[PDB]
Design a protein around this ligand. Sequence first.
Ligand code: HEC
Ligand SMILES: [Cu+2]
Ligand code: NA
Lengths: 125, 147, 105, 382
Amino acid sequence: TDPRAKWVPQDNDIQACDYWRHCSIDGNICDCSGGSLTNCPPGTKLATASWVASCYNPTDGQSYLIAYRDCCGYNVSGRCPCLNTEGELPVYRPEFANDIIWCFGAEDDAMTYHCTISPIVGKAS
Amino acid sequence: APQFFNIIDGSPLNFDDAMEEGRDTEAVKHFLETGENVYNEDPEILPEAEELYAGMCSGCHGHYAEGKIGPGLNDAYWTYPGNETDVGLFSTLYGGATGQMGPMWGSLTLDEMLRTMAWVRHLYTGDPKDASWLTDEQKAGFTPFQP
Amino acid sequence: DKATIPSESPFAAAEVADGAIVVDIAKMKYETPELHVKVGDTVTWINREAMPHNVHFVAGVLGEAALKGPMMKKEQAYSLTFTEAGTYDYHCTPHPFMRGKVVVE
Amino acid sequence: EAETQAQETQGQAAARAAAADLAAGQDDEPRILEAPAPDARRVYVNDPAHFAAVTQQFVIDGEAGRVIGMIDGGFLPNPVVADDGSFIAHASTVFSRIARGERTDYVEVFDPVTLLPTADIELPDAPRFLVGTYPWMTSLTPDGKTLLFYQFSPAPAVGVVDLEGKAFKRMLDVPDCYHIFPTAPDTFFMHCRDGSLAKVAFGTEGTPEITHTEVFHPEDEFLINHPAYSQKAGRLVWPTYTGKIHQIDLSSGDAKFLPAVEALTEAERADGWRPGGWQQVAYHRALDRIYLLVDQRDEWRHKTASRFVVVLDAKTGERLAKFEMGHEIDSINVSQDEKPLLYALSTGDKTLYIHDAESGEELRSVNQLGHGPQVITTADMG
Ligand code: HEC
Ligand SMILES: [Cu+2]
Ligand code: NA
C-alpha cells in the first residue's frame, strides 16, 4: 500500500492504522499494550489534555471529533505504531497538532509517551 | 409577519411602550412587516450605528463586541439561539434579557435599535456563508471584521 | 485558599442553577473575558462546543499550587467559588492562547 | 548485520592493516580514540527513536561515510551544534525510574573531539517543551554563548541558558508564538499564531522588548514545522504545505519579506505534487539555493516520506534540478562547503544516504542508525 495515497478509513479492526478513529493518531495504539480503544493500560497515567481531529466514520457517514489523549509514565510500547494526519495543522495551531506529547493533566505529572487512545468526544463537521 | 416575543418569558412584546419618535421610518415598517433589517451593511448608516453602539454598548460588550464584563457578540455562538436572526436580536434589545441587560425601549427609538443592530452584525468575525441575516448581495460584499 | 471547588468532576450543564453566574466557552474563547463578581460568588464555566476545554490557574493564583481544572466536553460545567478579593487570570491547558480573567470584588 | 559498500571498504581496509601489522610484528595496545577534528563534512544524525525514553545521536564523517562517534540522550532531546565547530550540546530530559519518577531537564555541552561532557546545566522546574524534534525549538545565539529553549505550558516562554557561565538565567515571557531564530546575542524572532513574526530583544534583567512585523501569510496557508534557517546569512526559508516558499531576510536586524516563490511547477502542482516528510527543506548559503523534499501525494499525507528533491535558485525561484532519490526519504540537509553533499535520511531504512548536491547522484550510505532517525544537523564553518 502506497503511504502517500489518500487515506481510506475502515470500521472493522481497531489495531490497524486505517481504522477510522485513528485519522490523526501519532504513536502507538493502546489496545496493543493492555489498554483498549478508549482506555489506558494498567500502570500508566491518563492525560486530560490532547489534540483533536474530525474523523469520518464510513459506517454511518458521520464525522466525529476524536480526542487523542495519551497514556503516560511509561516508555513507548513499541506495538502497533501508526501516524496519520487528516486535518493535522502546524504547531502554532496546537489544538490540531499531533507531534506534541499530549500528556498534560496526567497524574504524578507523568510526561513520557506510552500510547494513544481514540475516544469520541462529540459530533464534528 | 414575524412573531415578537420576550426572549425570556415568551410573552408578546408591547410596542405601545415604544417612543413615538422613530417608529415611522421605512426601515422600521419594513422590519415589523418582514423581520428583515434593511440597515445591514448599509454604508450610509454604519457611521452613526457605530456611535450608537459605542455610547450604549461598548462599556459592557467591548469596543468591537469581543466581550468584556458582558459576553461577546461577534461570533456564531448565542446564549439565546434566536439572536442569529434579526427578529430575535431585536426582541432581545426591546424586551431585555437578564441582569443588567434590560429593555432598551426607554432609551432607543425603534429606528435606532435597528441601526445599532446593523453595527453588531457588521462586527461579525465568522464566515460570511454563516451570516443568515444577510442577503446574497450583502454576503458578496461582507468581510469578517478586523480591528 | 482563594477559591473552593464545589465539584471535582464536571457535571451536566442542565444541573447548572438558573440565574447562576455563567461563562460560556465557544469558538475557542471564553465568551466573557473579564468577569466581575463579588466575594462568595460561584462562577460556572460551560463548554458549548465539541472541542474540549478547561480552566487552568498557574501556581500562586488561587493557592500555593496551580489549579488544573478537568477537561469539559460539550454541555459540561465546572464551578469555582471565590472567597478572596482580587484578580484571577486563567487559560486553557491545551490552548495557551485561550485566556480569561475573573475579578472578585 | 548488512554492510553498505562504504562500510565494506572500511572494514576491508581495517582488516588489511591489522593483518599487515601482525605480520610485521606490531602488538595491539588498546586506548580510547579521539574523533577527527570538526570539519565541513561532519554531519550529525539524531534518533528520537519513536518517542523512546532514551535516544542516541550519531556523529558521521560525510566524506568517508563512517560513524566517528555517538552521544546518548534522554527523552526527545533538542540538539544544537556550534557553527564554528567548537562544541555541540543538547537540551535533554531524564527520569529517576526510566520513564517515571522525578524528572530532570538539563543542558549538556560536549567537547567536539573527545565527546566528553564539559558542562551539565540543570533547568529548574522541568520547563522543556516535549514534542517531535524541531531543530528551531532550541537555538544558539550567533556568538555561541547563549542557548534559548521553548516552553509551551503553562504559558509561552523562552528559557535563557548562559553556556559561558554554565548556568540557567531566566525565563522570558513571550506572546503566543513558536520557534526561535536568534539574530544577535540579545535578539531572536518567533513565528506567531496570528501570522506575524515577533522580534524579541532581551537583556540580563527587565521585561523584554517585543515588536510584531506585518502578518505575512493568511490563516489558510500552513507553514511547516521544519523551516530552514541560516544564521550566518540571516535567511529564514519557510515552505507551506503546498510548496510555496516564504523567505525572510533578517540580516539587517529587522524582518524584510522577500517575494514568495512556488517550489513546484504549474504542471507538478496540477499532477498532485506536494512537499512531504520531516525536515523537508534545506538551504545552502554560499550557492543561495533551496532544496525541497517532494512527491505525488494526497493533501493530508504531509508527514510521509518523499522520493524526490527539487532544487531552485533562492534569489529568482528558477528551477535548477529535480533528483530521483531512489529511496523513501524523510529528511534532508546539506554541507555548507564549496561542493556540497546532499544528506538524505530514511527513517524507515534507518539509513543516511549521501548524495552529490549538484548531480543528485548517490555516493555512499550509512545504515543501522538507531530505531527511528529523523534529524540531520550540519555546521556552517565557512
Ligand atoms: C452592561 C450594563 C450592558 C450594556 C450597557 C449592554 N449589555 Fe448586552 N448584555 C449584558 C449582559 C450581562 C448580557 C448577558 C445577559 C443574559 O441574560 O445572559 C448581555 C447580553 C446581550 C445579548 C445576548 C447575547 C447572546 O449570547 O444571546 C445581546 C444581543 C446584547 N447584550 C446586546 C447589547 C447591545 C446591542 C447593547 C447596546 C444597546 C448592549 N447589549 C448593552 C450587559 C450589557
Ligand atoms: Cu481550550
Ligand atoms: Na457570542
